[PDB]
Amino acid sequence: MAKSYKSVALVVGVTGIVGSSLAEVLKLPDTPGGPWKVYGVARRPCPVWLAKKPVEYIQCDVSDNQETISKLSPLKDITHIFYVSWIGSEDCQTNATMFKNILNSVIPNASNLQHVCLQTGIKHYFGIFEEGSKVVPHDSPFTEDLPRLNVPNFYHDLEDILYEETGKNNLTWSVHRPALVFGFSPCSMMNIVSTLCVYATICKHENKALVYPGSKNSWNCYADAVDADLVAEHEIWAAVDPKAKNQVLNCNNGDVFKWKHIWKKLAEEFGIEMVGYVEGKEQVSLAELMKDKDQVWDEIVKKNNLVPTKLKEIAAFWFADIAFCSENLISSMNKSKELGFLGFRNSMKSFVSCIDKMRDYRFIP
Amino acid sequence: MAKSYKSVALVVGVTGIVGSSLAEVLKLPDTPGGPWKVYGVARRPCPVWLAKKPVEYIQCDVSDNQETISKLSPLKDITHIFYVSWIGSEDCQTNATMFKNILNSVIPNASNLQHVCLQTGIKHYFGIFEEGSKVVPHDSPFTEDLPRLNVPNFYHDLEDILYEETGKNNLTWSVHRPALVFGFSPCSMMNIVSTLCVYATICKHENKALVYPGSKNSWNCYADAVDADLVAEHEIWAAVDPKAKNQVLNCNNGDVFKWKHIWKKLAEEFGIEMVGYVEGKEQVSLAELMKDKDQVWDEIVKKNNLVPTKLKEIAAFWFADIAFCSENLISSMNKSKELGFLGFRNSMKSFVSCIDKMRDYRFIP
Ligand SMILES: NC(=O)c1ccc[n+]([C@@H]2O[C@H](COP(=O)([O-])OP(=O)(O)OC[C@H]3O[C@@H](n4cnc5c(N)ncnc54)[C@H](OP(=O)(O)O)[C@@H]3O)[C@@H](O)[C@H]2O)c1
Ligand SMILES: NC(=O)c1ccc[n+]([C@@H]2O[C@H](COP(=O)([O-])OP(=O)(O)OC[C@H]3O[C@@H](n4cnc5c(N)ncnc54)[C@H](OP(=O)(O)O)[C@@H]3O)[C@@H](O)[C@H]2O)c1
Ligand SMILES: C/C(C=O)=C\CC/C(C)=C/C=O
Ligand SMILES: C/C(C=O)=C\CC/C(C)=C/C=O
């Protein structure tokens, strides 16, 4: 195909928590559909760490249609699209615009396009806005055959565009609904591992205890997650395997864990005392505990010689608070299994795996 | 070795909920280590359904040592022992004597014995008798590396005899701790699927609704189980694969379910109405409402031409009562996964598959 590649990927959201994994996994010689040529699209200018990646980086505001057409239409060789991004808000039309503009720019020009992977999430099973009355969310373990809830969810819009555009043209599709993503990206708007690692790094820096600010339920309830590299495996799988073509597929590690056990590992990996859930104590907003704490992070990045990140950029404490008030949100991976996908991760090891990687990439050690 | 077999299995507890699966899985040509010769042991005289199997049945009371020597010592060809039985009570020593008498009989006589699979269970993680005050069990997800609880448990006695006897001789070993077993045996003391099916069959017979008698928690909590065939696959795996030798291994379906969803499928498969958990209602002994109900079952077996089974023999309502006042007992299959075992079951499909199979063998409808 191109030069002498077998497949050419277009990772939209390459700086993302999943997009970064695709930027590594795709370039492996063992990766199916290889050898892979990878285009990586993000809004920000290419960071230092992604410059060290064998990926044709593309700086484009996908919300801007004319800019998208200008930068993507020359890419005649694209074979698989991995839409792994979102605007940063739950705005349905702005998110749809991005996805539309990708398809509007590539489909007519890419003469050998085959597949489009659309990544959404488990929120497709329980998304609710105006809380205080009706519309009851689905019960878990969530299965892909569950119908949409009567609410505005941009996941709906994205699927609609996906189903239609991949229908008008002889294209295959695949919808991926990952669980909580354990990743390493420092520029994700939702990186739970980096967030908790930052909180840990700061607790240690001030010689304070790693205090669990969450709820009683989230401390003891069964929770599930998914390694970012696995979501990469799962999306690549659906991209090349006929068995997974035109299918909606969940994606988790295959196991369950508890935050009480994660919290201990987090403290052990940092060598500090931890304060687990106190009986009777109510949840405290970690976003409040870490407000006005940026200078402390600025200092840490200097003193520890870490890759320059701002606290707002690498940590989403609001996202932790939500996860720490969430129970009964486990998804099923039977479908992918029965379709032949045998990918799994020990969630406990995966968490440490993400800590170690962000240490290796100088985001946190 | 024998006749023209590569492996000769001694299944101890062949009429059991797992032993009966082993009686089927082992005789398949696909099964690793094949072709298998199978000796099957139980205290009762061979049932009609086991008579229809290619398994050398041996009626022996293993609690009797001299009897065990008399019937097992002439089996010079045994290669693998699958101890999948228990006395019926929590009696440590009485359970131990059985496992002893097996090893005391076969080991000196079987000159090509290689492996001994010991099946126990997840009660290794939460066995308690004086549950009114002190002594606290482990927390889930249960892992194999969890230390024994300071409580008399015959699982400990079995492992000790296992570790020692497999040490004195040059034998491998494997401890299996299955979760709730979804099986088909009509002569098991703990068959949760046959029990609930029997209850459903009776509710249908009297034109009554399938009323959930359990607790609120067990209705909503995540639960896990294991297909008996999977346990058979998992023990056979540990008996032929060097990666699994000398290892403690849990055994579940790899997923989680809820009883509220199982209960609905049970009503659907029997085509009757059902009453789920009622808010405020408390658990009712299924054993109590099914007592003085054996007269009805004797009639049902006749009218439906079912295989002659007494109510107390095929159903353990006390065991259902226990399952319906339980939660937080999920085990981890990560260890077996990482060792290479990729066996899994959709627990929902497994449960229906067990209903279907017992209908095929005329234990039900
Ligand atoms: N995060 C999780 O734990 C998680 C878990 C389950 C499901 N999901 C879902 O998976 C989907 C993917 O989200 P994610 O978590 O992968 O996102 P992420 O890791 O926060 O990264 C988002 C990517 O999109 C790019 N982007 C955002 N706005 C853009 C624009 N206007 N133009 C061009 N590029 C833009 C970003 O690049 P810049 O750096 O330039 O902004 C970034 O690379 C989301 O729908 C999310 O709901 C996420
Ligand atoms: N049942 C479950 O759902 C479950 C789940 C997880 C773990 N486990 C554990 O797995 C282990 C195996 O139990 P299981 O469920 O396989 O038992 P089971 O299905 O109730 O069957 C027990 C077997 O042992 C035989 N047996 C009993 N006493 C005997 C004696 N004195 N001499 C010879 N044979 C005898 C029985 O044959 P007869 O019919 O002749 O007595 C029967 O075939 C147990 O430790 C149990 O705790 C069970
Ligand atoms: C809901 C939750 C913790 O409550 C985590 C999931 C967040 C995400 C991105 C779900 C997929 O849209
Ligand atoms: C404990 C329980 C429901 O409470 C189910 C497990 C029963 C068994 C046989 C566990 C293995 O010892």
Curated annotation (Swiss-Prot), chains A, B:
GO terms for biological process: monoterpenoid biosynthetic process. InterPro entries: NAD(P)-bd_dom_sf, PRISE-like_Rossmann-fold. GO terms for cellular component: cytosol. The keyword Oxidoreductase applies. CDD domains: 5beta-POR_like_SDR_a (cd08948). Its EC number is 1.3.1.122. Expressed in internal phloem-associated parenchyma (IPAP) cells. One of its GO terms (molecular function) is oxidoreductase activity, acting on the CH-CH group of donors, NAD or NADP as acceptor. The active site is at residues 123, 155. Substrate binds at residues 123, 155, 326. Gene3D superfamilies: NAD(P)-binding Rossmann-like Domain. Changing residue 123 to A: Reduces enzymatic activity 6-fold. It is found in: Cytoplasm, Cytosol. Iridoid synthase that catalyzes the first step in generation of the iridoid ring scaffold using the linear monoterpene (6E)-8-oxogeranial as substrate. Iridoids comprise a large family of distinctive bicyclic monoterpenes that possess a wide range of pharmacological activities, including anticancer, anti-inflammatory, antifungal and antibacterial activities. Belongs to the short-chain dehydrogenases/reductases (SDR) family. Highly divergent. This is (S)-8-oxocitronellyl enol synthase. It comes from Catharanthus roseus (Madagascar periwinkle).
